Amino acid sequence: HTSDLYQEILQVPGVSAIKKLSIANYINGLRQTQGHPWYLQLTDQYRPVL
């Protein structure tokens, strides 16, 4: 859920406001989807990293 990242990006000193935020899934270096502003579904066999 993107709000879990929104609320932590808003905690860094110097950040005033978040005008845009979205996330996307990559496996093997290739983009798997188009992305979504509010939530993303993960693959069964894989752990998320940054």
């Binding site: 845009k20 979205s22 188009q34 992305g35």
Partner: protein, 114 residues
Amino acid sequence: LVELFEQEGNNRLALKNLPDENAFARFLADQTLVVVYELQDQQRDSCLLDCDDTGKDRNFRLRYFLLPRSVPEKLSAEALLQQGFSREPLPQQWRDFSINDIFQAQSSFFQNFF
């Protein structure tokens, strides 16, 4: 409002699953259809694999609603007619008619007044 659809969905119950034919008949009683033509502006976003951004695309679609004929405190066909047609002051002799009465007085003319 009660919405109708051609396809199933998450909150879209099938009419086939109504308890009985009389339940269907009571469901379709004293109600009208309206077809609404709705406009919207979709925002372009290059982060969403669009070719560009900083712009909007206007697009429209159709929606079907099942509306009550007459309900004193909610949206009903009579309320829509009142809103649409009763915008200007009418001649004095018509002031006491509802919109559907002011329409029916002209077809039921010859049954009376002959």
